[PDB]
Design a protein around this ligand. Structure first.
Ligand code: NAG
Ligand code: NAG
Ligand code: NAG
Ligand code: NAG
Ligand code: NAG
Ligand code: NAG
Ligand code: NAG
Ligand code: NAG
Ligand code: NAG
Ligand code: NAG
Ligand code: NAG
Ligand code: NAG
Ligand code: BMA
Ligand code: BMA
Ligand code: BMA
Lengths: 485, 485, 485
C-alpha cells in the first residue's frame, strides 16, 4: 500500500489584514497594532514628577503671583499648564516670553535664593491693588518694586557677583507707567532706564510712558526680562528709574524637565510617556495621540493604524497541504504534518519550524526601532498667537519630522510585513524541502503541497519522517516497486 | 515519442536600466520615472486661486501702495510675488519684514475693514510726493499719516475693542523724519513715541530722527509694525508723535494660503502643485524641480531621475525557457509556455501568473508613500539677504529635509525595484514549480527552464498542462516507459 | 560504483555577528564597521584651508583685536575657534552675536577694504588702555572711535555708495559710556544716537549711559552692529554721538567656508572631513564622532557600531554540503564542490557563483547612500549660553536629524545584511539547482546539500559537472540501472 504524509500551516478563521510591500491588504493569522491611537485621558504622576499649574502659568509661578505662592521653590519633571491658568497680579509682558518659559521649564525648578540686594535712596516692596497678597496691596513675591524714597530716586547701581558654581537666573522687570505724572511720582526722573548687565551680556530697557488697556485696573505694565549669570560672572543693575528689581536668583538646572499645556487631570498611575491628551503606553513603536510628548514616548505618526503581521499568511480551509490551503484545525503549532496511512488519519505539529518562525517574528520590530526615543524638552508645537517667521519655522520643523517619521512607519511596517510573510512562506517551503530530502525516491509531491509515500508507512514511520530520523533505504525497494511498476 | 514544454517570460529589445539593492544597474522590461524633473514653465490658476502681484510686493499691497490699489480686499490661495515688484510709495522698512509677509500670506486675504479711529488735534491723511496716487501727493491707502493740527500735536490716545470673533491685524507705522526740523514741523514734540498695545502685548517705538539714503526723494522712513488683536481684546494706540496710524484692520483667516516668489506666467491650466518654476504634475511621488512648492506637490529630492521597475528582467533572445533567455516574441502576457509536440511548435501566455505579477507591481509605490503631501504655507527656502542665525536655521532645516527625503527616495526605489525583480523571478519560478507538480513523473526538467515530457503530448494535452487540468496518471505508464526504459 | 558531489560554501573560524531584519545577531563570514567611531584627534590642514584662531574669536579677528592683527585679511575654509580664545580689547557685546559670527564664518574672509570715510568736526582714532596695541593705548583696527573735536561733536552724516558688484559688510559700533560725565566728555550730546542705514535697511541705536561690570578696567561697552550693503546700495551713517564708526568694509563671499569650535591641533595631514574631535576618515557612511561636521563627512548616527555583512552566513564545520555546515577548509572561493569518487576525494571552488555574490555585495552600501553629504556651513549644535526659543529650535532640529539618520542607518544596515544573507543563500541554492539540473536523473539529492551520482564519476566527469559541460545522456543508462535496479 501507499501512505500520504504531507505538510501544512495553521490558519485562523478570523484573520487580520496587513499592508506589505507587494500586497495592498493581505490577510494574516495574527497582527499587532503598532500605533498608540488612544490615551487614558489622565497624566500619570509617575515616574516623572508632574507639577500641576492649576490656575498658574509657569511665568506666573516664576514671578511670584499672589495666587501662585504655592509654587515657590517648586521642582518638576513636567510642568502642566492648564488652559484655565490666569494672571491675577500686576499686568506684565515678557519680551521674548517663549524663551523665558522654555528655559524656566528646562531648568525644572523654581528654587529661588534671596540675595542681599542693597537699594539705597529708594522705597522697596512697592505694591499694587492688582496684586493683592492678602487684605491689602501686594506685588510679585520674587520682584522688588523700587520707587523714590521721599522726593528723590537716585541712580541705583548695585552689583551681585556669582561666586557659586551654577548659573543664576535673575528675573527683573521694567515698569511702564501710563502717564508722565505716574512716571515722575514713582520715579522723579521724567524718563527712567534699566541697564542690567554682566561681564559679557547687557540689557538696557527704556520704560515706555504711554497709556494702554486696563488690566486689573491698571494701564501700566511690567516688561519682564531675565539675566543668566554664569559662575564667576557678576550682575550689575544700574537704574535711573522704572526698575522692578530682582529679590534674588533662581537656581538654574539642566535635566529632563519641560513644560506641557494640558487639561488632562493628574491620576495616581505610572506611565513613562505623557501627552497633552494624557499619559499613553509606550509599548508600541508609534503613536497617533499627540505630536507633543514628554518622556519615553512612541514616535508620532500621521497613521491612525499600522498593523504589523505577527503571524503568517491566512489561507482558511483529501488532506491537501499548504500549497492548497491553510489548516484551521491545527493549533499545536504553526507548521505541521497531516498523514493518511493504513492506521488512519493523523496530525502532528512541527515544533522546529514553528519555533524558528516565532523566534524570527518575535523581535522583528524591536530590532529596527531603538528601545524608545526619550524626549524631555522640545520645541513648541501648538501656538496660540500668530508670531510669524520663528513660529513658521517651528511648525515646518515639526511637520517635516512628522512626515518623515510617518513615512518611516509606513515603509517599516510594509517591509516587516513583507519579510514576515516571505519568512513564514520560506519556513513552510523549508519544511517541505526537508521532507522531500528525507523522502528521496520513496515519495512524490502530489502538487497540492502533499507527498505520496509509495510504501506502507505506519505511524512509527510517520514519526520518523516528522522528526527527521527517516531512513529511505529501508523502504526504497518497496517504494520503487510501487512507484515505477 | 516525446514533447517539450518550456516556460519563459516576455522580453523587450528596448530595456531600461534601474537600480536595486543588489545590482547597480539591472535591465528591466519597463520602468517609470519617479522624479518630476520638468515643469510647464507657467503657473496654473486652478484649482488654487493664484493672485499675481504684477508689480506689487505682498507688503506693498497690504500697506496700500498707490500702484497696488488693485489688490485691495484681495484674497488668494497663492500670492505670486514677481521679481519685478517694486515700491513706489513712501520709503519704509518692516522690522521683522519676513514675519509680516509670512503671516499676511498665511492669512490669504487683504480684506481691510475701515474703523472709526478718532484722532483729535492732529491733521489726518498726510501725504508725500513719493506716493503719488493721482495729480498730487498721496500716501498708503491703509495707513493714516497723522500730523500736528495747527501748531500742536496732542498725546493721541485712542482705543478700538475687538468685539468681533476673529483676529484683527492692525498695520501701523512710525515715521522716522530726516531731521529734527522735520520732526518738529510734523510733530511739535522733539521726540515722538508710538505705543500700540493690547491687553496681552505691547510695542513701543521711538522714532529715529536721522538722515539716510534718498528713496523717491525722501531721507525719511516709515517703520511698519503690526498688532494682532484677538477677539475680546482691545487695541490702544498712544502716540506722542510720529504715528502712521492704521485706518482699520485686515481680517485674519487661517487656511491653505501662502506666498511664492516666481516669475512664471499664469496660464489657463489646472495643476494642484505649483513651483516657482511653474506648475508641475503631481502624478510622480518625487520632483526635482524646486524645493519651494505649494499644494499637492511631490516630495523634493536631489535625484534628477529615479526609475522604478514596473516590469521584470530583460534577458533578450531550441525553445529554451526562462533559465536560459527571455522571450522577445511573446506579447500576449508576461509569462508563458512554448511547446514542441508532434503537432508542431506553439506558444501560449500564462494569464494567471502574468496578472499576479501585474497586480503586485501596479500599486507597489502607492502603498508605501501617502497619496501626496499637500503643503500650503512653508518656511522661506530662498533668501536674498544674509540674515544669519534664523536664515541659517531655515536653510539647515530645508537641507536636512531634502537630504532625508532624497535618501528615502533612493532607498525606496532600490527596495521596490529589488522586490519587483524578486517578485517577477518568483512568479516565473512558481509557474515552473506548478508545471513540475502537474508533471509529477511524466516530465524531466532539462535545466533550461523547460520540461521534456516523455509521452505523446498533443495540443490538447499541452493546453491541459497550461490550464492546470493535466492528469499525470493518464500518461504515467508511457512516460515511465520512455524515461527508464 | 557511484560517486558523491557535495556543494558547500566557505566558512571562517572567526565569524562576526551582524544584525538583520529577521535575526537579532547572525554570524557572517565577514563584516565591516559602517560607523566611524574614532578620530585621529587632529585637524587635517588639507584639502580645506584651516585657519586656527589660536587666542582669537572670529569676531575678535573681525573687529581687529590688537592680539588678532595676525588675522587681518585672512581667508579660511574652516575657522577653528579654540576654547582658550579671549578678548584683550575694549569690552564689547554683539547684539545678535551668533548671526554675525555665522555670516562672517560663511563669508570665509577677513579681507578688509579701508574706505575714505570723512568725519568732520570729530576726533578720530580714539583709543583706550583696554586695547594695548604696543605700549600705548589702542583700539580695534577695523573700527574708528570718533570723539568730539575740541569742545563740540557735530551731527556726523556720511555716505558711502556701494558702486562695486559685491556685498559690503560694514562693522560699526555704538559706545555705551558708564556715566553721563563720560558721555558728555566724549560726546557733547547728553544722549547720542547712531543711525546706520541703507536704501532698504536701517539700524538706529541709542547709546546706553549706565555702569556695568569692569572688563579690562572699563565699565563702558561697545555694541557691535553690522550692515550689509548690496551692490548699487548706499550706506548712510548719521550720529549725534557714541559712534564707533567703520574704517571700511569686509568683502563678502559665498562658498564652502564655516567656523568650528575645536581644541584639536592642526596637523600636516589630509582629510575631507573635520570634526571638533579632529579629522576623521569619510570612507564609512556614518560616524559616531561628532554631530558637528565640516566637509565631506559621514552622517552622524547615535549608533557606535553598525556592522554590514560583507560575507555570507557563517556555519562552521562524510563531506556533507551547505545544508549541513559551511566549509572551513575551502579558501579558493565562496562556493564550491567536494567530490568523492574512485579516484579519491577532491575539492574545487565555484568561481562563477563566488564572483556573482562578491560583485553583488561589493557596492550594496554605496548604491543606496550618496557618496558623502558635503556640508560646510550649518547651524550651531553646541551652545554655551541658555538662549531659549531659537537655541531650543536648533537643538530640536539637530536632534530630529540625528534620530532620523540613526534610524536610517539602523534600518539600512538591517536591510542590507538581510539582503546579503538571502543573496548568499540564493547563490548557494542556485548552484545546487544548476547541479541538480545537470544531473537530471543521474544523481539523487541526499538532503545534506549534496548529490549521490549513480555512475562512475571520475575527476574528468566531476570537472564537467562543475563547469556545466556535463552530459547526463552519456551516463543515464548506468545511473538509472544503479538507481532503480
Ligand atoms: C480698553 C481700555 O483701556 N479700557 C479702560 C476702561 O476699562 C476704564 O474703565 C477706563 C477708565 O479710564 O479706561 C479705559
Ligand atoms: C545716498 C544719498 O543719500 N543720496 C542723496 C541724493 O540722492 C540727493 O540728491 C542729495 C540731496 O540732498 O542727498 C543725498
Ligand atoms: C563687578 C565690578 O563692577 N567690579 C568693579 C571693580 O573691579 C573695580 O575695582 C571697582 C572700582 O570702581 O568697580 C567695580
Ligand atoms: C526657598 O528656598 C530658599 C533656599 O534657602 C529659602 O531660603 C527660602 O526660605 C525658601 N522659601 C520657600 C517659600 O520655600
Ligand atoms: C557703579 O557700580 C560699579 C560696580 O558695582 C562701580 O564700578 C562704579 O564705580 C559705580 N558707579 C558709580 C557712579 O557709583
Ligand atoms: C489629543 O488632543 C488634540 C488636541 O486637543 C486632538 O486634536 C487629538 O484628536 C486628541 N487625540 C486623542 C487620541 O485624544
Ligand atoms: C473692501 O470691503 C469693505 C467691506 O465693507 C468695503 O467697505 C470697502 O469699500 C472695500 N474696498 C474695495 C476696494 O473693494
Ligand atoms: C487713554 O485712554 C485710555 C483708554 O483708551 C484711558 O483709560 C486713559 O485714561 C487715557 N489717558 C488719558 C491721559 O487720557
Ligand atoms: C527651477 O528654478 C530654479 C531657480 O530659478 C533653478 O535652479 C532650477 O534649475 C529650475 N528647475 C527647473 C526644472 O526649471
Ligand atoms: C588688506 O587688503 C587691502 C586690499 O587693498 C589692502 O589695502 C590692505 O593693506 C590689506 N591689509 C593687510 C593687513 O593685509
Ligand atoms: C545728510 O547726508 C545726506 C546724504 O548722505 C544728505 O542728503 C542730507 O542732506 C544730509 N543732511 C544734512 C543735515 O546735512
Ligand atoms: C568628541 O568630543 C565630544 C565633546 O567633547 C565628546 O562628547 C565625544 O565623546 C568626542 N568623541 C570622540 C570620538 O572623541
Ligand atoms: O473693565 C470694566 C471696568 O473698567 C475699569 C473701570 O472703568 C470699571 O468701572 C469697569 O467696570
Ligand atoms: O538719485 C539722484 C537724484 O537724487 C535726488 C536729487 O538730488 C536729484 O537731483 C538727483 O538726480
Ligand atoms: O577686578 C579687580 C580689579 O578691579 C579694578 C581695580 O579696582 C583693581 O584695583 C582691581 O584689582
Amino acid at each position: 500500500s501507499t501512505a500520504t504524509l504531507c505538510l501544512g500551516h495553521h490558519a485562523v478563521p478570523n484573520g487580520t489584514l496587513v499592508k506589505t510591500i507587494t500586497d495592498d491588504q493581505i490577510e494574516v493569522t495574527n497582527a499587532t497594532e503598532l500605533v498608540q491611537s488612544s490615551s487614558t485621558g489622565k497624566i500619570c504622576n509617575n515616574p516623572h514628577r508632574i507639577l500641576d499649574g492649576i490656575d498658574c502659568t509657569l511665568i506666573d509661578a516664576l514671578l511670584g503671583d499672589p495666587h501662585c505662592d504655592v509654587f515657590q521653590n517648586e521642582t518638576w519633571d513636567l510642568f502642566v499648564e492648564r488652559s484655565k491658568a490666569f494672571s491675577n497680579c500686576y499686568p506684565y509682558d515678557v519680551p521674548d516670553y517663549a524663551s523665558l518659559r522654555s528655559l524656566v521649564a528646562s531648568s525644572g525648578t523654581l528654587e529661588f535664593i534671596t540675595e542681599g540686594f542693597t537699594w539705597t535712596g529708594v522705597t522697596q516692596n512697592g505694591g499694587s491693588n492688582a496684586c493683592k497678597r492678602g487684605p491689602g496691596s501686594g506685588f510679585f513675591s520674587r520682584l522688588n518694586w523700587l520707587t523714590k524714597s521721599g522726593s528723590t530716586y537716585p541712580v541705583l547701581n548695585v552689583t551681585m557677583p556669582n561666586n557659586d558654581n551654577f548659573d543664576k537666573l535673575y528675573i527683573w522687570g521694567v515698569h511702564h507707567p501710563s502717564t508722565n505724572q505716574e512716571q515722575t511720582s514713582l520715579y522723579v526722573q521724567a524718563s527712567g532706564r534699566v541697564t542690567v548687565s554682566t561681564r559679557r551680556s547687557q540689557q538696557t530697557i527704556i520704560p515706555n510712558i504711554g497709556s494702554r488697556p486696563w488690566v486689573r485696573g491698571l494701564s501700566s505694565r511690567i516688561s519682564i526680562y531675565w539675566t543668566i549669570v554664569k559662575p564667576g560672572d557678576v550682575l550689575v543693575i544700574n537704574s535711573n528709574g522704572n526698575l522692578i528689581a530682582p529679590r534674588g536668583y533662581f537656581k538654574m538646572r539642566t535635566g529632563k524637565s519641560s513644560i506641557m499645556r494640558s487639561d488632562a487631570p493628574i491620576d495616581t498611575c505610572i506611565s513613562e510617556c505623557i501627552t497633552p491628551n494624557g499619559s499613553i503606553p509606550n509599548d508600541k513603536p508609534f503613536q497617533n495621540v499627540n505630536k507633543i510628548t514628554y518622556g519615553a514616548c512612541p514616535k508620532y505618526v500621521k497613521q491612525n493604524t499600522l498593523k504589523l503581521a505577527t503571524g503568517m499568511r491566512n489561507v482558511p480551509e483529501a488532506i491537501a497541504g499548504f500549497i492548497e490551503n491553510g489548516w484551521e484545525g491545527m493549533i499545536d503549532g504553526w507548521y505541521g504534518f497531516r498523514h493518511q496511512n493504513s492506521e488512519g488519519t493523523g496530525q502532528a505539529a512541527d515544533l522546529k519550524s514553528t519555533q524558528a518562525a516565532i523566534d524570527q517574528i518575535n523581535g522583528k520590530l524591536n530590532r529596527v526601532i531603538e528601545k524608545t526615543n526619550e524626549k524631555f524638552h522640545q520645541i513648541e508645537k501648538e501656538f496660540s498667537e500668530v508670531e510669524g517667521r520663528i513660529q513658521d519655522l517651528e511648525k515646518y520643523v515639526e511637520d517635516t519630522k512628522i512626515d518623515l517619521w510617518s513615512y518611516n512607519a509606513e515603509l517599516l511596517v510594509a517591509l516587516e510585513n513583507q519579510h514576515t510573510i516571505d519568512l513564514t512562506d520560506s519556513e513552510m517551503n523549508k519544511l517541505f524541502e526537508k521532507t522531500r530530502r528525507q523522502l528521496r525516491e520513496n515519495a512524490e509531491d502530489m502538487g497540492n503541497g502533499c507527498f505520496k509515500i509509495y510504501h506502507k508507512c505506519d505511524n512509527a514511520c510517520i514519526e520518523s519522517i516528522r522528526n527527521g530520523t527517516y531512513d529511505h533505504d529501508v523502504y526504497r525497494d518497496e517504494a520503487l516497486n510501487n512507484r515505477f511498476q
